Design a protein around this ligand. Structure first.
Ligand SMILES: Nc1ncnc2c1ncn2[C@@H]1O[C@H](COP(=O)(O)OP(=O)(O)O)[C@@H](O)[C@H]1O
Ligand SMILES: Nc1ncnc2c1ncn2[C@@H]1O[C@H](COP(=O)(O)OP(=O)(O)O)[C@@H](O)[C@H]1O
Lengths: 505, 505
């Protein structure tokens, strides 16, 4: 009964109160200071919840549904939760009127149904051919984050980056984000960032006496120990004369050269690994004319593996005339400050990376967040093929269309549905609020400007304060992201109500 | 006297107050947070009592009778207890009137008798031939749990799954649930779950160089250590020259190959065990063309043992030309995300398994609960052969029929019986309550609609709020489950009253 159910609700409303002021494209920012001392300020939902530990079960339950939503991009999780808590709020008012929660559930379900198809039988068909459209959908996502200086630059990139990896595995597209690497290093402004048509390794070469530019390379992904073997563990021993010394360090030096020749046995122009490479073994590779790289996060070896059609050598005594990937040109431009290795024109085409350079140690970090989400979302538009105008446009519609529905739904459930609708408009008010305008004023002024059947795409320009056509202003979103959000929010919302009591161990 | 007897009752009523709000098919849900931090919300009685530690003796005594009821399925234990506590409540009112508890006992006994046969001489004869009926009885059980999306899918499965294992050992059916394995792994929705006509092992093959598909296999259930023998415990020793090394690791490697050949001595296409298999022994089995699996819960070896007509090899030096089971086709489809081994078309027909895939790490878990109970109950319908319409239909009947009985029973005992009846209707009110309708209103409106001798199967549709024919709406239950419940509840109920005082050590 009311006992605990109030608590869960409480907790949920609580989570809402944590993002509410950051919703919308011109929302606020929350600050986060690591215990280490480092500060990071943002308005990315995932981060605001990952870095913010909540304890109450209901809450972990809400976020579990929100973050681990139904798809790629992190977008809409912020909606999923806000809208989620709003249903809870507006549902609370129903319990006050004494309507069994089981009813508010059915009410919401039926409302969800309609609310949902109302997006389908309204969404517009977007095809990856139309490149001038995604140019917008991209900004409609990244323009939302801190970094809003010359976004067209980043926006444009994001579009090319995805269309590059896309495929048509049986008239059914499949964009695998893993085919894109993202590396970042301080320096200049964000305009100094660019996309490379191949993998990019952030780690300077091992020795200066090595080829800093190979034509038609044959990469050798060697993952294993490549340094003189400490021989102390194997043996503890004494020594007399210098005659013994020589033959000791000589063959021991020849032991590493063995692994090296056994690898060059495939004849590779370049060889990179993820462990410490001996300094004596460098002079050897240097004299051989090989290009080698020290420790390097396995995280990129893989992305570089299937990007150059090679294998990540497990055991050196097993290397094959094929485990080595091919390329076209390797380089090491000292871009920014440090020097990085490039592997442009790989064997595998659909495989590129992006290089972020925000400038400051932290500004760069959040550019990566925005970019991650930006890419994800764009890929989702393609994987599906439906896209609607964002701006609260779909909210008010889902509302109105819902109000005309309620009347017939039934006795009490009606109230549930009428509610589901009101809670939903609350969504757009919050959006207005953060814009700095009277939420009620514009909401009424907008839901009014939706009488004209030819305004479906009308929303509220958060800079001029007035209803305008969102679509014809470059503001679109994956009709699926803001759709799964609704399924999500309602899932959570009705789930909290389904709960009668909590007993833990 | 009143002294302690109040306490026990108190405790019992207490247990009722813990499930009451979860009774019925549209009941509430209770939340459970493990001390580890993980949360599980449910309305399955067993779980609500297992995960909820009660201390008072009476309570452990009630649940002992309830859980360890009289049969398979966990269903009705929730009834057994609620109804149990209701008799206690309504019996308490009798003590208030000063009627020795010994009398309330006899009262209840005699009422139980009648209440019981009233189900027999009223139940309808169901035969396993009628497959279109169990299609319902299954839903009448699983539709009750959280997972209510496309249940017809699961419901249908459950029916085929049992009829598959059923037997007629001397015109007396015997369904052994153990002949059905249940494996679960996240991924997609629940619609992505299916039943396999043979055992299914959740564990990827041991080596990539092995046959991932054998025609007509001869399984070898080898339960024992299959890895190079650590020789340190056996011996501690020194070493000089490399001549000694070779003959050491060589024969030691040949030691494991021995066990392998001694097993292949039966000539098996596949061999799986429940321990760690050496990596060198893999290269051997790989070169031999055998399909082997690493550690695997003994829990499935057995289900796979008598499912393929083989023995679980205790000692490798004892394997026989028969201890190995036969099959038809083994496979390893990467269904979902990970890869699992299948053993379809085994030697033994009546032996299948079910694969659950709810999607989320927890959603999948409760689908297994619902499914377990769902299977159990269906099997019980067959083992017996009698089934009645659920929906409170039988309650009100057992009531009415009971009221006409009371008058003749006797002086005081009458009140006991009239009570036994009232307490029983309370059962259906609780059911109504959770539906969101006035318990009294409908109960009277329903027990009224039972004047018409042709409505016996009439109950209250918990979605429209009105008496309708439950039977003709696909709502049936094992006339035995809701029968043993009554025996159970009354057992417990009268047992608490039989107690005069508790003295512990
Ligand atoms: N340019 C824009 N003009 C008006 N509304 C916008 C614009 N961009 C996004 N929105 C609205 O903001 C809503 C929420 O997005 P946002 O606040 O960025 O975080 P999230 O996508 O995680 O909810 C979406 O409903 C959306 O249509
Ligand atoms: N579809 C239905 N319509 C009406 N009553 C139902 C339906 N399904 C089950 N019931 C009633 O619910 C009662 C209790 O079942 P339930 O609440 O699921 O848990 P348990 O079986 O453990 O008591 C049974 O008496 C039963 O007939």
């Amino acid at each position: 009964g009311k006992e605990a159910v109030r608590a869960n609700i409480a907790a949920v409303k609580a989570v809402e109160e944590a993002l509410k002021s950051t919703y919308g494209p011109r929302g606020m920012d929350k600050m986060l200071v690591d215990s280490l001392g480092d500060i990071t300020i943002t308005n990315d939902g995932a981060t605001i919840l990952d870095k913010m530990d909540l304890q109450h079960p209901a809450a972990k339950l809400l976020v579990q549904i929100a973050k681990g939503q139904d798809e790629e991009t992190a977008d809409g999780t912020k909606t999923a939760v806000i809208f989620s808590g709003e249903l809870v709020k507006k549902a609370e008012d129903l319990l006050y009127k004494d309507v069994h929660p089981t009813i508010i559930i059915s009410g919401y379900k039926k409302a969800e149904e309609v609310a949902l198809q109302t997006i389908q039988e309204l969404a517009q068909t977007v095809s990856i051919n139309d490149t001038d459209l995604l140019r917008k959908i991209a900004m409609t996502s990244l323009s939302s984050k801190a970094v809003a200086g010359a976004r067209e630059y980043i926006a444009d990139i994001v579009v090319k980056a995805v269309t590059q990896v896309a495929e048509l595995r049986g008239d059914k597209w499949y964009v695998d984000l893993d085919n894109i690497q993202i590396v970042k290093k301080a320096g200049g402004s964000i305009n100094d960032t660019q996309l490379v048509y191949g993998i990019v390794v952030d780690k300077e070469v091992v020795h200066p006496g090595m080829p800093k530019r190979l034509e038609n390379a044959k990469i050798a992904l060697i993952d294993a120990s490549l340094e003189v073997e400490k021989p102390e563990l194997d043996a503890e021993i004494r020594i007399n004369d210098p005659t013994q010394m020589q033959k000791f360090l000589d063959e021991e030096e020849n032991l590493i050269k063995e692994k090296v020749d056994k690898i060059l046995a495939t004849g590779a122009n370049v060889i990179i690994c993820q462990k410490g490479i001996d300094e004596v073994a460098q002079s050897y590779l240097a004299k051989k004319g090989v290009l080698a790289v020290r420790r390097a996060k396995k995280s990129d070896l893989e992305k570089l593996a299937r990007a150059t059609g090679g294998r990540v050598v497990s055991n050196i005594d097993e290397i094959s005339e094929q485990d080595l990937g091919y390329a076209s040109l390797i380089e090491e431009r000292k871009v920014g400050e440090d020097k990085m290795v490039f592997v442009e024109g790989a064997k595998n085409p659909k495989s590129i990376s992006i290089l972020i350079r925000g400038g400051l140690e932290r500004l760069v970090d959040e550019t990566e967040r925005a970019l991650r989400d930006a890419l994800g979302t764009v890929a989702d538009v393609i994987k599906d093929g439906r896209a609607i105008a964002g701006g609260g446009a779909v909210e008010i519609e889902i509302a109105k269309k819902l109000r005309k529905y309620a009347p017939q739904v039934g006795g009490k459930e009606q109230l549930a549905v009428e509610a589901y609708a009101n809670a939903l408009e609350s969504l757009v008010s919050i959006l207005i609020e953060n814009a700095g305008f009277d939420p009620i004023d514009l909401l009424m002024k907008l839901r009014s400007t939706h009488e004209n059947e030819n305004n479906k795409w009308y929303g509220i320009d958060l800079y001029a304060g007035q209803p305008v056509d969102m679509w014809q202003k470059g503001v679109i979103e994956p009709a699926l992201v803001k759709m799964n959000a609704i399924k999500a929010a309602t899932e959570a919302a009705t789930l909290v109500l389904r709960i009668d009591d909590v007993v833990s161990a």
